[PDB]
């Protein structure tokens with residue numbers, strides 16, 4: 052397990068997200084599904100010039116897995132996935148200007164629902180989650196686990212767990228007052244209302 056500090060802009064944004072009383076928290080789901088849709092568009096796109104990129108799985112979909120007992124909502128996709136360098140530094144590098152601009156927009160009176168327009172929609176997870184775990188597998192690398200409960204640090208380790216084939220699992224460890232997002236009728240209504248997604252989105256209903 053390696054521990055890293057977030058870039059200053061991103062730690063400032065996470066501190067603002069984690070601590071905000073911003074009522075419209077439901078936007079987190081459309082943001083995470085949009086990340087999944089962009090990852091599915093990328094792997095589909097790359098497969099048109101190199102069909103072997105789909106040897107790790109041909110199905111292109113999104114799964115929504117609420118878990119009341121564990122207080123977790125998992126977002127699973129079979130997109131391009133992320134490499135070790137994407138998790139530690141490369142996605143954060145591209146996100147730097149977007150993060151700073153989003154915060155300037157918020158200072159100028161803008162709404163937290165604009166987060167996606169700045170390319171940093173992933174961090175909207177912290178509106179409802181006290182900790183986020185990211186399990187990911189890209190074709191050019193090993194399976195990795197990324198994790199952060201904010202507070203300025205994140206960890207990256209090789210994932211010894213169940214092999215994924217290719218894609219990303221975003222595990223939201225929900226805050227005590229945000230358990231409504233584990234309810235089947237709530238997920239359904241949010242997916243219908245806010246969710247632009249040219250891939251099947253399947254809600255796993257709890258037995």
Ligand SMILES: CC1(C)CC(=O)c2c(C(F)(F)F)nn(-c3ccc(C(N)=O)c(N[C@H]4CC[C@H](O)CC4)c3)c2C1
Pocket residue numbers: 086087089090093128130131132133137138139142143146170171172173174185197218219
């Ligand atoms: C690395 C992170 C842990 C922390 C981070 O900063 C961050 C950001 C960023 F804010 F930078 F935009 N976005 N982001 C994220 C989260 C899920 C996914 C998905 N579900 O695959 C994703 N896919 C990108 C991967 C690159 C491809 O070109 C396009 C599809 C990106 C994360 C996850």
